[PDB]
Ligand SMILES: *[C@@H]1O[C@H](CO)[C@@H](O[C@@H]2O[C@H](C(=O)O)[C@@H](O)[C@H](O)[C@H]2O)[C@H](O)[C@H]1O
């Protein structure tokens with residue numbers, strides 16, 4: 001109990017940033033860079049779930065590989081592409097906006113809560129820019 | 141016998157502290173998004 | 178024979194209390210080191226932060242080929258390793274996250290020293306290291322008016338955001354400050 | 356019998372509180388010097 | 393007695409989130425995402 | 441307590457971590473997680 005309860009509080013994800021690819025005039029990808037918290041242990045991104053409260057939908061995304069209504073983790077810095085082992089590891093959480101619901105238009109707001117296996121919830125309110133003209137890639 | 145009672149109450153205090161810690165962090169997360177926006 | 182029975186049970190309850198005594202002490206020892214660690218990294222996250230002193234870039238013809246940044250420790254900052262740091266480049270065209278490299282690159286960044294001992298670690302308050310980024314390699318040589326949004330993320334998590342704004346006119350400028 | 360049990364666990368709890376007390380104080384000591392500087 | 397009393401305290405349910413559907417202008421669905429608490433055994437959600 | 445790091449395993453590097461439990465004759469365990477500083481630049485002696 002002491003080990004799991006401390007895990008529930010300690011092993012938590014901090015989202016460094018969130019940017020999104022733009023096709024035509026709509027955000028088609030939602031990309032999130034994640035990192036450990038203070039005192040976190042090895043955080044597995046395969047046993048994590050993401051809650052997508054989109055403007056047109058609301059579903060809980062689960063892990064996948066090579067998406068649709070799931071999420072993928074491509075690596076940025078480090079060895080493992082699914083596990084955060086050290087404090088200097090960055091992994092990119094990958095979400096397809098035009099596959100989990102509808103393509104995010106300029107101004108759409110989606111709430112993302114990344115829940116670790118032990119139950120540490122991290123909520124990021126992604127807000128598509130109100131204006132998207134002449135912006136190849138936006139910063140959500 | 142006294143040890144038996146201590147272990148059970150020990151679990152509750154760890155669980156209760158986890159509940160209290162959850163409220164502080166989650167409320168901070170909500171306020172962080174509110175403040176950033 | 179009631180004196181026999183109490184003796185045997187008395188031994189057992191001594192052991193049981195010793196068992197429970199171990200659980201509280203061992204679990205506290207676990208939480209002692211876990212809590213001690215938590216304070217140090219959390220303080221490192223807030224304090225050990227990179228501050229950009231000045232930004233400039235070499236320009237060729239009329240599009241800044243190279244982007245250079247000068248960094249330093251913030252107030253009350255421990256050693257800051259620039260090798261375990263990732264600058265995220267959000268440019269007019271591309272938008273990727275750069276990683277450390279050595280000897281000049283493509284989608285990476287290099288840190289050459291200006292003042293101090295190490296050329297990748299900021300040890301004192303008077304150390305200046307030049308973060309080197311090839312603009313034409315990460316995307317394209319920014320023309321007059323491009324606006325890159327750089328953010329340097331330290332290993333512990335402290336983020337410094339710098340909006341590198343190229344001047345609207347690049348005429349008669351060997352090397353201009355971004 | 357039960358008197359023996361409560362004595363040993365009593366020793367345990369003060370040491371645990373002593374352990375907990377040290378953690379907060381030493382952490383405050385690190386934060387004090389870091390905060391002061 | 394020791395086992396069930398420990399299960400009463402340890403085996404608990406944690407509600408991760410609470411979303412719901414919307415019809416016309418009224419919530420017609422209440423959905424809860426649940427998970428084990430710290431150090432919990434198997435939790436059959438049929439006997440709950 | 442003197443412990444030669446280079447012999448037990450290898451001389452630790454910046455960012456390493458060792459879990460030490462110093463147990464007495466009677467079984468009292470004391471756990472210490474020694475953590476080498478993430479940077480060893482210009483420091484004759486550190487503090488794990
Ligand atoms: C979020 O991560 C995606 C991971 O695949 C990126 O995907 C790539 O985007 C490139 C381009 O920027 O459109 C394509 O050339 C690649 O084929 C595609 O996999 C995406 O860019 C990023 O925003």
Ligand SMILES: *[C@@H]1O[C@H](CO)[C@@H](O[C@@H]2O[C@H](C(=O)O)[C@@H](O)[C@H](O)[C@H]2O)[C@H](O)[C@H]1O
Pocket residue numbers: 105106107108130131132133
């Ligand atoms: C500039 O004004 C435009 C006026 O039409 C906006 O266009 C609409 O934006 C909506 C949304 O906010 O993204 C879309 O749902 C509409 O289809 C689109 O015409 C535009 O967003 C704004 O930047």
Ligand SMILES: *[C@@H]1O[C@H](CO)[C@@H](O[C@@H]2O[C@H](C(=O)O)[C@@H](O)[C@H](O)[C@H]2O)[C@H](O)[C@H]1O
Pocket residue numbers: 233234235236243244245289309
């Ligand atoms: C960013 O820093 C670079 C560090 O190498 C500078 O590189 C030098 O630029 C010189 C010139 O200004 O073009 C060349 O003569 C050197 O060979 C080249 O390494 C760069 O200028 C600066 O913007």
Ligand SMILES: *[C@@H]1O[C@H](CO)[C@@H](O[C@@H]2O[C@H](C(=O)O)[C@@H](O)[C@H](O)[C@H]2O)[C@H](O)[C@H]1O
Pocket residue numbers: 411412413414421422423
């Ligand atoms: C709670 O979970 C329900 C599980 O069935 C969801 O049910 C679906 O809701 C859809 C819509 O959002 O109203 C309907 O098209 C489906 O037929 C219905 O099963 C419910 O949405 C969710 O809130």
Ligand SMILES: *[C@@H]1O[C@H](CO)[C@@H](O[C@@H]2O[C@H](C(=O)O)[C@@H](O)[C@H](O)[C@H]2O)[C@H](O)[C@H]1O
Pocket residue numbers: 258259260261297298453454455478479480481
């Ligand atoms: C600053 O960052 C450097 C990035 O390479 C670190 O370099 C590595 O340090 C390791 C160890 O921590 O000493 C060595 O095993 C590696 O070979 C070395 O490249 C450096 O430690 C750090 O202070």
